[PDB]
Each structure stands twice: as structure tokens, then as C-alpha cells.
Amino acid sequence: ANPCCSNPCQNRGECMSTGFDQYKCDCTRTGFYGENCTTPEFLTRIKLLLKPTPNTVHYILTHFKGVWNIVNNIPFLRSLIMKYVLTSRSYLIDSPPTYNVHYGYKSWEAFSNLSYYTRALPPVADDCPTPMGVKGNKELPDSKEVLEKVLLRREFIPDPQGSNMMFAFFAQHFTHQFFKTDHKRGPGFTRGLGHGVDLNHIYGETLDRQHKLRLFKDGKLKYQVIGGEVYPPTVKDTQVEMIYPPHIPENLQFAVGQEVFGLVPGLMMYATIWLREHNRVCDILKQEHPEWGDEQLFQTSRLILIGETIKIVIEDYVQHLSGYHFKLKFDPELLFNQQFQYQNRIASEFNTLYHWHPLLPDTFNIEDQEYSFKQFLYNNSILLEHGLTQFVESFTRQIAGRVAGGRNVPIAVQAVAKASIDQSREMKYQSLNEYRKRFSLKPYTSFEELTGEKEMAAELKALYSDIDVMELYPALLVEKPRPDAIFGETMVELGAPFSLKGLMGNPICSPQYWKPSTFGGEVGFKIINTASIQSLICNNVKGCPFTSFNVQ
Amino acid sequence: ANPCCSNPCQNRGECMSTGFDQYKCDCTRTGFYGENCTTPEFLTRIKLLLKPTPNTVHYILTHFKGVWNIVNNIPFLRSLIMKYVLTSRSYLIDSPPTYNVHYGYKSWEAFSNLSYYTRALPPVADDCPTPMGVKGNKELPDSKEVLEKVLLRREFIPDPQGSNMMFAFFAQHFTHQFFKTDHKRGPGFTRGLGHGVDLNHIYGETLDRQHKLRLFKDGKLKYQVIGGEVYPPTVKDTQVEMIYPPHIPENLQFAVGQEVFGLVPGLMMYATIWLREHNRVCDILKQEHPEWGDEQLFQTSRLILIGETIKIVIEDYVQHLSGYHFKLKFDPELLFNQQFQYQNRIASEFNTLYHWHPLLPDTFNIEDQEYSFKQFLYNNSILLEHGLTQFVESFTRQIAGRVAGGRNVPIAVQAVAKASIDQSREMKYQSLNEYRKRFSLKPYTSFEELTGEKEMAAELKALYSDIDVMELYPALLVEKPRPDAIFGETMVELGAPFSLKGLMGNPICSPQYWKPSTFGGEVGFKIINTASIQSLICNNVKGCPFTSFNVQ
Ligand code: HEM
Ligand code: HEM
Ligand SMILES: *[C@@H]1O[C@H](CO)[C@@H](O[C@@H]2O[C@H](CO)[C@@H](O)[C@H](O)[C@H]2NC(C)=O)[C@H](O)[C@H]1NC(C)=O
Ligand SMILES: *[C@@H]1O[C@H](CO)[C@@H](O[C@@H]2O[C@H](CO)[C@@H](O)[C@H](O)[C@H]2NC(C)=O)[C@H](O)[C@H]1NC(C)=O
Ligand SMILES: Cc1cnc(NC(=O)C2=C(O)c3ccccc3S(=O)(=O)N2C)s1
Ligand SMILES: Cc1cnc(NC(=O)C2=C(O)c3ccccc3S(=O)(=O)N2C)s1
Ligand SMILES: CCCCCCCCO[C@@H]1O[C@H](CO)[C@@H](O)[C@H](O)[C@H]1O
Ligand SMILES: *[C@@H]1O[C@H](CO)[C@@H](O)[C@H](O)[C@H]1NC(C)=O
Ligand SMILES: *[C@@H]1O[C@H](CO)[C@@H](O)[C@H](O)[C@H]1NC(C)=O
Ligand SMILES: *[C@@H]1O[C@H](CO)[C@@H](O)[C@H](O)[C@H]1NC(C)=O
Ligand SMILES: *[C@@H]1O[C@H](CO)[C@@H](O)[C@H](O)[C@H]1NC(C)=O
């Protein structure tokens, strides 16, 4: 019924109904005009001939390594390239945010209600003839059928970029501070009201939780010493709610910021490392400021760890997955003379694309042992048995799975991969091609072009009929990877701008925050600016074991 | 004890303790260096020798009528000048925000907790020897004494600028959407989580309250007809909580967005006008979009009214209190190529300086009647008796009281003016001169330079002894006003930046919002852009009576 169901507005034009069977396209500031904002202005014609494709740019960043090695060693040259890539990755995100699962038009409710994930593309209206709007059939192909045919893992396909379990678990741990779906409400709702990197997965979402986690001495978090090693406190000791199955003994119910971090020992490992990191910084700050109270030590350390997190995420985590020869740089100063909004809102699509479950192995290898999922899940005994050092050493050695390329979702979490598909439909996601146009990519003209092969393509062809009906979530997982890369084109081009706004949009990056006195002075500022995944592990894990996000 | 108690760091440098009896100034990006950030850098002396004083600028804006009349009728020039005021007023407010009542240093608690008012200056530390830091006596002079001797009104002092009661009530009605102190928590806490122009004073702070106030047909608000006139609904009809003395009959308990608006017929006047305006826009929108449902009609109307509000606030309200001959202009497009943060946090000091109770007359004059405060307060019968048209005609004629210049606070609200003193101290506000310095104003060298006279001046001298202990709030009401103006220098120079952030920081002013489709097309857009206090009253008040913020 709705005349905007076909999404006729192109180039980010906005559709608005003007009657029961007529629409209008607001082409304001798009660089295009006409009934569907398709005919381009003069200056835009120039842009479209001067800008290279993402793949073109990806090739350059992944080749000419000898050249990039020269760039990386000339500070001013490195800063200027980083400056460019920063601002080029910026025009794509609505900030302040716009739509959400309940609002396909901008509303104050959509802007003001922090309980919703935001939305890169508005939902397909409820009164549309087909799930993707007008194209395709009345009902979408069976999620089970999609899942079993092109997503499930036959045999393990290792990531060619060599991502390890330190990478996979860091990904899960890091992202789960802002991907926290409130299932009571629905899939388009979040419990992470910070909408970014606030480290609530360490400190708790609410004040009441943070206080129960706090020692209230020297600014530290409560902790216990098992054997001679520092571990999170228990639920029994702190009364902070954690999600554990009932058969788990009270002495193994470790209590941390995020309620769900008992699920995986790989999560608990990072929670443990970061807990030690917080208290280590507390000692450093106390030594610098013997006049400080508990509250200021706690607050300042938190700001520093927020800083370390952003640093490590950009210069180690994203550095690895990007595969770029260019050496990325965390430096808020690069934005101080640029137009940029120091705020962020977590997009539902960011959450959806970040379901990187194929990363997981069939078994978890920690020294001698090979644990299955059922042995691993909710088992913190394993962390105690092997200790932090063995965990880091083992995780650094174990290869993770490829995400794109299709058929790599471990069977153990098949219900999750299915849920991602159904909840995407439930939230009325537009099609894959709709999202590609929205992030300035050319739409796939066939299923074979998407996969880069033939068997999965034909398998999808018979399910979806039309390529413009292909769904976003299954696509990125089945998408033809870049050469020897973990991710395909759509994954990177969607995830990058979302991620940037997450890290860079943090208030500590704003000019009035990014100064030494914010962070207790020069030594605290130095902690943020010299942080790395290796230093994080080296300062808090006994023996200073080597680590990286890739297999050596 | 705290070595930063004396506020040693100048030019917006940040003080930090480096021990028990030592400190350090963070001069980052201040344009100054040295121990106390006082010796200017080279480029800084230029700026200092090239910028005029606020008084110099105010002079030029309030004189040369003839020249401004030419500028006003050259859209190019007018727009160019507006852009320049817009930016010259936007380097003063910390955005994202920083300090609050509980945090004299930056912390994640102060940033993320939306229940606090933010603070333009950090609070004086608790362990400081004196309320102002180190200057003055152990205890501040009796607030009752300061109240009586320099604040309370002897006889009514009219505003030379000719501000009327339409202005006074508009100031009270408008600002009370973002000045909503949660007295359960303390004076440093707000109930206005939107922290700006969200029109919650019409639609309610929460969803539950909003839905109770809605008619759920044609996007409209609930209302009743008394006589032949449209009034807000009642408490029995909507079940929304209102504040009313127990003797108020049920049929007079009017339910509006702000729970306190039933205490003043003046407030109830604007609540009624704005309620009518919303429903009016619903009629227009439904006509344009017969295919739209109740929800979209309501949300779009709300966005349009927010826009109308900002438009009227800038070009009528602020236009009048400014006294500028230059025609101010509401145009978000003027910021699009500038650096500007589309966000806002309501400062405690903005709240304090906006206590304009001297505006209130001794009696409220509606036609033949002259009501006292007792007769006026919580008396909605007065509104029903006379009607809206007469309210408008009368309040347009009645002069408001001068705010600066001392001794003009009506006795009926002496407890209010005193509370502003007590609560300022309770919130550990820094001194007047500190705030002047903070906002690039030269410190007053004597109590007589502050007041411009001698009797109040000496009166304050015997109370505060040193002018560097003069408190912010009483100073604003006792300050030497600009020539025949309602306000003094300090009032305007603190008020402007805060007010700007509040208005222009609204999300509807962001590039992605400021377009026709956001407001239902060119027609809804046109309602914002042609809005005025006169058209607001003309469209919604029977007989379309003349109105302005100035006595004719
Ligand atoms: C042993 C390892 C893992 C297990 C058992 C697991 C299992 C699950 C389950 C059951 C859910 C749905 C829970 C719910 O919605 O309440 C989920 C969601 C999710 N998973 Fe995993 N997962 C694992 C590893 C990972 C990894 C390595 C990533 C890397 C990015 C990841 C990304 C996500 C994301 C982004 C969500 C959505 C979370 C939300 O919105 O609340 N997971 N996972
Ligand atoms: C008949 C007229 C008025 C009366 C009886 C009145 C009375 C009061 C009272 C009793 C309070 C304290 C409320 C509380 O502590 O809970 C207050 C606060 C305040 N007043 Fe007024 N006032 C009037 C007019 C005005 C006007 C014309 C302005 C112009 C700006 C104004 C500005 C304010 C502000 C900004 C607050 C702080 C509000 C908050 O934080 O909740 N008032 N007034
Ligand atoms: C915003 O800050 C306020 C002030 O601390 C927080 O309020 C307190 O909450 C704790 C329990 O969590 C109570 O014990 C205190 O009495 C509260 N303070 C009061 C009543 O002034 C509030 O929790 C913060 N808001 C959020 C959302 O964290
Ligand atoms: C954000 O929007 C959600 C969705 O409407 C609101 O949740 C509804 O709130 C009402 C109360 O007014 C409840 O009756 C419903 O059960 C809620 N629905 C869902 C799906 O949760 C929520 O109240 C809004 N948040 C704010 C702060 O206004
Ligand atoms: C699946 C993902 C693909 N890409 C990701 N993120 C980036 O590509 C990305 C960042 O996250 C980012 C962070 C800080 C500054 C700049 C960048 S980036 O240029 O957007 N880029 C590498 S996540
Ligand atoms: C007591 C007050 C004194 N001044 C006030 N506000 C202004 O002076 C002011 C605005 O509020 C504002 C609004 C929108 C755009 C620009 C301006 S302003 O230049 O900061 N100015 C007149 S409030
Ligand atoms: C209007 C109510 C006046 C408050 C009563 C206390 C007055 C004490 O104050 C005195 O009042 C006189 C009156 O103008 C002034 O001449 C004095 O300077 C002042 O000190
Ligand atoms: C605009 O889109 C409609 C609907 O998809 C299509 O039928 C029409 O041909 C397009 N018109 C123009 C001028 O591009
Ligand atoms: C949990 O892990 C421990 C590791 O010591 C293992 O012995 C045990 O079998 C596991 N429990 C389950 C239920 O798999
Ligand atoms: C800096 O300020 C302190 C505190 O007011 C003062 O004692 C000191 O003399 C100042 N130092 C300089 C170099 O101005
Ligand atoms: C209420 O207002 C009426 C006029 O409508 C007035 O006569 C009466 O005195 C007022 N009530 C009080 C308690 O002052």
C-alpha cells in the first residue's frame, strides 16, 4: 500500500508519501535531483569519475609494502594519510542518528529513546506486499534452508590472514560492551545505553553494579587471589548478577561488568586481564597522586583504560583485520580542525554484521587438551586449571575460522546463525543491495558475482530467485572474500564507518578531554599513547608471554 | 588543603594536584604557557590586541540603527553577519560536557550521567579553607542579609527595554522545559534528560506521560471545550500527575506536559496556546497526508513545533532581550560548513542566571482587575474567566520589571531568591570574578564598578569585604545594567553561549534533519521558517490580537 515500499529514492534521497499511491523524493544535499534523485549535478559527475572503488583502494593498501614502509617511518606523512582516511570514512553515518526499528521516518522518539539501536537504513514498512518491499515473493526463503545450505560448516575453513583465538575472543569481549540486546523488549533494543566504548563490560552498566564491583580503596575493583593469581570476585561475595546455569558451583561464578561473560572462558580471560590492568593503573596513579582519594583514582583509571582500549582496537585489532600495510594511528588531534561529531549511536546493522561466529573453532585447544563446546561453555574451571599464561600462549597459537567465503558457521552455534537471519527479518531489514547502495557500493547483479563461485550461488539462486532479494546477514558470510582475506567487500565497507564513529566519537577524543590532566597527568597520558595488545598482556600476565592477533 | 583551591591556573588551564601541597597547570590549547598559564604565545597577543570588549560589541549592536537597517535588508549581508555571531559565540561552552556538582575533574560518571546539570566551572573542593577557595572569610555573609539589603524590591522598577508580561511568561514557560531541578536528589540534578528544546513541557518527559496526553486520533493532543474555547484536558481525564494544592476542584486541574504549569495562569496561557498550535499542525499535516496514521501525524507535528519554538526564541524572544538593531536569523544551514557539535548539556549556571524573578510585577493586570500573588497563583479560574484573548491583550500592555540594577525582586518570591543564594553555595559555585574570567570578562575591581552606584556598592562591601568573594547570583541582579537595558554585562555574556548551544545544538538543526521531508514536506518546513510570536498567537487565539514582547 505504501508508495515508498519499493525504495525508489536513490543516492540517499528520502522517500515521503504524498497520497495513498504517490511519493516524493527529498533530494536535498545529495548531489542529485529528479523524481528518484538519480540524475547528478555537475560537481557530482566530477566526484564520480575521480573516486576509486573500495577494491581499488583495498588493493593499494594491501600492496606496495615497500612503499608503505617508507610512509610508516615518516611521522608527518603517516599523520597526513591517517588524517585522510579518517575524514573519508565520515560522510556515511547519520550523526545525530535518525531511524530505528519502529520509525522509518525521523521522529523525536527515534532520536531521544536511547533504548533502541539506531538504523542505517529505515525498516521496510509493515504494509508492504513483500518482505523486501515490492520485489521477491510473499514469504522469504526458509531460514533453515539458507542456514543449512550455504552457512553451516562442513569442514573447518581457517582464516588465511591468520587470525587466532586471541583475536576472536578480543572481538567478542570488546564488542559485547555495546552489542547488548535487550531480549525482553525485542531485537531492535539495547541495554548498552552508553552506545559505545564506555567499558561497562568491566565496570557495569549502572552505578549500583559498579559500586558492588568496587573495592572502595585506592580506586580498585574487588578481586580474589586463587593460588597466587588475581581473579574476579564471586557472585556470592559481591551480589552482582551473572548469567550462569544452575549446576555451576558458587566458587566458580566470577562476577564482572558484563552479565554474560561467564559464557566463555575466553571472555573471562579478557575480563580478568582488564581487571588486573585497572588495578595496575590504580597503583601507578596512587604513586603519582598520594593526595588522591579512592573515587578520583577509580575515575581516572577508567578514563585511561577507555583510552588504552581505543588505542589497542585501532593499532592492533583493526590493524590486523584490515590487512593494510599502512600503519593505522590513534590520534584524536587529527580531527581537531575537521568537521566531526563527538557522539555515537550503535546501529542495528553493525551488530548484525559483527556476528562473526565462523571465527570459532570446532574444539578449543589449550595446551594438551582439546575442549568441545559443551566442555568449554560456562566453564571457568578451565581458566583456573591452566591459568592466564597458558590461555594466552594457547590462544595465540590456535587458528580462527574464515568469516566470509561461506559454509564456515560451526554447527554448535547453528541456532545463533539462524536467529540472526530470523531477527533480521523480524526487524524488517532491507535487502543486501539496498545496503550496498547506501554504503556507496555497486549492487551485485547476480548470486555468482556475490559468492565468486558457482555451487553456493546456484544454491542461493534457487532460494531467492532475485539477487535484489538476497538478505544482508547471509550475504556477508557467503560473500566472495578479498584475496586471501577474512572478509568480503560489504563487510569492511559497512563495518569501518560504524566502528570509526564508535572509537573516534568517544568524548575522551574531544579537544577538551584529550589532554594529560584528564588522565592524571603525563604518566597516565603515556599509558594510553603507548598501549598495545602485547603490553596489556605483558603487564598483567605472569611471564610476559608473547601475543598477537595472528598466528606465528 | 587542596593545592588547587586558589584557582591558580588562568585562561582556562586545568589545575591538577601533584602532591599534597603542589599543583600543575595543564595549558594545553589555551594559547598561553608558564606555571599558571599566563604568559601568552605569540599568536595570542595578536588576538588580544585585535578583539573588542563585550561592551564595545554591544555598543555597535545597539547603535547605528541606520546602518543595521541596510544590513538587515541585504540577505547576503545579514546571513554573513549571523554566521559570524554564531561562531564567535561557540568556543566558550565545553561540548561534550565536563564537570558537575560532584566532579571538579573530568570523569566518565560526570560525562555519562544525564541526571546532573553540567558545570561551566568546576565546584570548589570540599576541603578548601573558604567557600570561594582561599579568599574571604570561613563563612559567606548571611544570605538573608544579602537578600534584604540589595535584592528585595522597594518600589517597582520597570524595564527600560519595555519587556512585557508576554515576554516574562514566555521566558518562564520556555526555559522550564530544561530547568527542572530534581529536588529529591539536590539542586545540581535535573529531571530534564533531554537537556534542551524537546518540548517535554508540552508532550511530557516520558512515553507513558505522553501517551496519556494524546488523543490517538489525527496525531492530536487531548483537549476539552469550555465555553467555546479549547483548553487542556484534566487530571481525571488523562491520569497524568500534576502539582496542585488540595483545594483545587477536579474540573480545574488542567493536565499539561510540565507538571508545575498549573501553578501560574501565565504558564497555563502558553500551555494552551502551544496545545492549540500542535493540533492545528495536525490538521494541516492530515490534509497534506491523508495516507498518514496517528503516530506519524503526532511525531511530525512535534518536530514542527520544536522548530517553531527555536525560530520564535531566536528571532522574537532573544531578538527583544538583546536590544540589537541587527535582525537575528534562525538558519541551521549557516553552521553546515563550520565546526559545531550538535549536542547540549544544560549547565547549572545557565539555570542560576536565568532566575529572572525581578520580571514579576506587584500585581498581575488582566483588564479591569489587578490580582495579587495569592489571587494569581494556582488560580486557573482567572484564565477561564477572562479568556485567552484578553490575557494576551493585557499581558502585552503590562510592563515587566528590570532584572539587573538591584532591588527589584518582589517579596512574594523572597524565599526563591534566597534559595538561589543558598543553593549556589550548596553547589560550591566559584566567585563572580572567576566566572567573568571563565567567560573572557575582566574581573570587577570594586563593588562600585559592579553596581555602577554607591549605596548598594558600599552595602555589599561591608558584607563581602573583598570583591573577589562576590557571589555570582546576587551579582547578576545587582549589576550595572547596559544603558537603558534589562541586563548587565555578566548576564548577557554567560547567557548567550549557553542559550546558543541549547537552540542550535538541537538535532533538527543538523544537516541530515534540516530538510523538507523531516517535517512532512515543504508545507511543514514553511511553518517553522515563517513562525513568529505574533503568528503563533494570531493562529491560536480568538480574534487574532496583536502581540509582541515590547510594550506599545
Ligand atoms: C564460544 C564462543 C561463542 C558463543 C558460545 C557464542 C554464542 C552466542 C549466542 C548464544 C548469542 C545470542 C545470545 C542472545 O542473543 O541472548 C550470541 C550473540 C552474538 N555473538 Fe556470539 N558466541 C561466541 C563467540 C562470538 C564471537 C567470537 C564473536 C565475534 C564478534 C561473537 C559475536 C556476537 C555478537 C555481536 C552477538 C549479538 C549480541 C547481542 O546483541 O546481545 N560471538 N553469541
Ligand atoms: C508568578 C510567577 C513566578 C513564580 C510564583 C515563581 C516561583 C518560583 C519557585 C517557587 C521556584 C522554585 C521551585 C522549586 O524549588 O521547586 C522557581 C524557580 C525558578 N524560576 Fe520562578 N517564579 C515565577 C516566575 C518566573 C519567571 C518569569 C522566570 C523567568 C525566567 C522564572 C525563572 C525560574 C527558573 C529558571 C527556576 C529554576 C527552575 C528549576 O530548576 O526547577 N520564574 N520559581
Ligand atoms: C546519576 O548520579 C546520581 C547521583 O549519584 C545517581 O544516584 C544515586 O544512586 C544510588 C544507587 O545507585 C543511591 O544510593 C544514591 O542515593 C543516588 N543519589 C541520589 C539519590 O542523589 C544515579 O544513579 C546516576 N544515574 C545513573 C543512571 O547512573
Ligand atoms: C523507548 O521505547 C520503548 C518502545 O516503545 C518504550 O517501551 C514501552 O514503554 C511503555 C511504557 O510507556 C511500555 O508499556 C511498553 O511495554 C514498552 N514497550 C517495549 C517494547 O519495551 C520505552 O519506554 C521507551 N523509553 C523511554 C526512555 O521512553
Ligand atoms: C569488519 C570491519 C572492517 N573494518 C573495520 N573497521 C575499520 O576498517 C576501520 C576502523 O574501525 C577505524 C577505526 C579508527 C580510525 C579509522 C578506522 S577505519 O579507517 O574506519 N578503519 C580501518 S571493522
Ligand atoms: C540573558 C541572555 C542574554 N543573551 C541570550 N542569548 C543570546 O544573547 C544569544 C542567543 O541566545 C543566540 C541564539 C541563537 C543564535 C545566536 C544567539 S546568540 O548570538 O548567542 N545571542 C543573541 S540569553
Ligand atoms: C523592601 C524591603 C526592604 C527590606 C528591609 C531591610 C532593609 C535593610 O536594608 C536597608 O534598607 C534601606 C531601604 O532601601 C536602604 O536604604 C539601606 O541601604 C539598606 O541597608
Ligand atoms: C522512479 O522509480 C519508479 C519506481 O521504481 C520507476 O517506475 C520510474 O521509472 C522511475 N522514474 C525515473 C524518472 O527515474
Ligand atoms: C568443565 O571443565 C572442566 C575443566 O577442569 C572439565 O574437567 C569438566 O569436564 C567440564 N564440565 C563439563 C560439564 O563439561
Ligand atoms: C601562580 O599562582 C600561585 C597561586 O595564586 C602564586 O602563589 C604564584 O606566585 C603564581 N606564580 C606565578 C609564576 O605567577
Ligand atoms: C481565584 O480567582 C478568582 C477569580 O477567578 C478570584 O476572585 C479569587 O480570589 C481567587 N482565589 C484566591 C484563593 O485568591
Can you describe what's shown?
The structure is a homodimer of 552-residue chains. Chain A is mainly alpha-helical and 552 residues long. Chain A folds into two domains: 41 residues, Laminin, CATH 2.10.25.10; 511 residues, Haem peroxidase domain superfamily, animal type (Myeloperoxidase, subunit C). Helix content of chain A is 42%, strand content 5%. The first copy, chain A, has 23 helices and eight strands. A two-stranded antiparallel ribbon of chain A has the order 1-2. Chain A has a two-stranded antiparallel sheet with strand order 3-4. In chain A, helix 6 packs across helix 16, helix 6 packs antiparallel against helix 19 and helix 11 packs across helix 15. Chain A starts with 13 loop residues before the first strand and ends in a 12-residue tail after the last helix. Chains A and B meet through strand 1, helix 5 and helix 12 of A and strand 1, helix 5 and helix 12 of B. The structure holds protoporphyrin IX containing FE (2 copies), a molecule of 2 linked components (NAG-NAG) (2 copies), ligand MXM (2 copies), octyl beta-D-glucopyranoside and 2-acetamido-2-deoxy-beta-D-glucopyranose (4 copies). One protoporphyrin IX containing FE (HEM) binds next to helix 7 of chain B.
Q: Layout of helices and strands, plus pairs?
A:
The structure is a homodimer of 552-residue chains.
Chain A: E1 14-19, E2 22-26, E3 32-33, E4 39-40, H1 42-50, H2 54-62, H3 65-71, H4 75-88, H5 108-112, H6 143-151, H7 165-175, H8 200-203, H9 207-213, E5 224-226, E6 229-231, H10 235-238, H11 265-288, H12 294-322, H13 348-353, E7 364-366, E8 369-371, H14 373-376, H15 381-397, H16 414-426, H17 432-438, H18 447-451, H19 455-464, H20 472-478, H21 489-504, H22 522-529, H23 533-540
Antiparallel strand pairs in A: 1-2, 3-4, 5-6, 7-8
Helix pairs in contact in A: 6-16, 6-19, 7-11, 11-12, 11-15, 11-23, 12-22
Bound molecules: protoporphyrin IX containing FE (2 copies), a molecule of 2 linked components (NAG-NAG) (2 copies), the ligand Cc1cnc(NC(=O)C2=C(O)c3ccccc3S(=O)(=O)N2C)s1 (2 copies), octyl beta-D-glucopyranoside and 2-acetamido-2-deoxy-beta-D-glucopyranose (4 copies).
Active site (chains A, B): 176 (proton acceptor), 354 (for cyclooxygenase activity)
Binding site for substrate (chains A, B): 89, 324
GO molecular function (chains A, B): dioxygenase activity; enzyme binding; heme binding; metal ion binding; peroxidase activity; prostaglandin-endoperoxide synthase activity; protein homodimerization activity
